[PDB]
């Protein structure tokens, strides 16, 4: 496993709309390697999620991996999920606000309003369709990472 360089706020890579992963990439060693490098990078930076644009890869891949760590001492622990081509199909009208940081925003945290619940459809790295309901802090990570795929940093969502 390799720890990749992470783009910081102000770099233009972080402002693009990341391109969807194509059919021939699904279940490829390319794609497995991409996800493994993202995963190592996130762990090394005590992230609870990561998006491919953050590691200069303008593709629609994210990792959602809520776990307590120094950066988030109170996060619930889930098994890390890698999502290819995620699409949020439903946001709840109910809001929750929480403090977010970001691997791409050194030394700034802010309060962000997010949907309490999201329903997300995505593909596994093999290419199989999955739909999952997330609540609370995992939901906020899903929203944060999808924002990265759409060129949005959490600083822009500060109410």
Q: Which residue of this chain has its Cβ atom nearest to Zn ion in the complex?
A: 102
Q: Are 105 and 157 in contact (CB under 8 A)?
A: no
Q: How far is the CB of 18 from Zn ion (least distance, A)?
A: 13
Residue whose pair of structure tokens reads 């290819």 in the numeric block: 84
| Piece of the chain touching Zn ion by CB under 5 A; list 70-78, 95-103, 106-114, 119-127 | 95-103
Q: Are 84 and 31 in contact (CB under 8 A)?
A: yes
Does residue 44 carry a catalytic annotation? no
C-alpha 159/C-alpha 23 separation (Å) is 38
C-alpha 129/C-alpha 127 separation (Å) is 7
List 11, 94, 131, 145, catalytic entry: 145
**Residue 61 vs 102, nearer CB to Zn ion:** 102
Q: Which of 45, 72, 70 is nearest to 136 (CA)?
A: 72
Site string for Zn ion, 31-50 (x = CB under 5 A): --------------------
102 binds Zn ion (CB under 5 A): yes
Q: How many alpha carbons fall within 13 Å on the CB side of residue 25?
A: 18
Q: How far is the CB of 24 from Zn ion (least distance, A)?
A: 28
| Piece of the chain touching Zn ion by CB under 5 A; list 18-26, 34-42, 100-108, 135-143 | 100-108
Catalytic residue annotation: 145
Binding site for Zn ion (CB under 5 A): 102
């Amino acid at each position: 496993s390799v720890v990749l360089p992470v783009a910081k706020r102000g770099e233009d890579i972080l402002k693009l709309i990341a391109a969807p992963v194509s059919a021939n990439e699904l279940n490829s060693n390319w794609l497995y390697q991409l996800a493994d490098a993202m995963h190592a990078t996130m762990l090394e930076r005590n992230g609870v999620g990561i998006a491919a644009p953050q590691v200069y890869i303008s593709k629609r891949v994210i990792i959602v991996a809520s776990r307590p760590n120094p950066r988030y001492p109170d996060a619930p622990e889930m098994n890390a999920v890698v999502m290819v081509n995620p699409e949020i199909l439903e946001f709840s009208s109910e809001m929750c606000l929480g403090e977010e940081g970001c691997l791409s925003v050194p030394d700034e945290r802010g309060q962000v309003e997010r949907a309490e619940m999201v329903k997300v459809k995505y593909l596994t790295l093999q290419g199989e369709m999955v739909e999952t309901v997330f609540q609370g802090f995992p939901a906020r990570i899903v929203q944060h990472e999808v924002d990265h795929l759409n060129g949005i940093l959490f600083v822009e969502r500060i109410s």
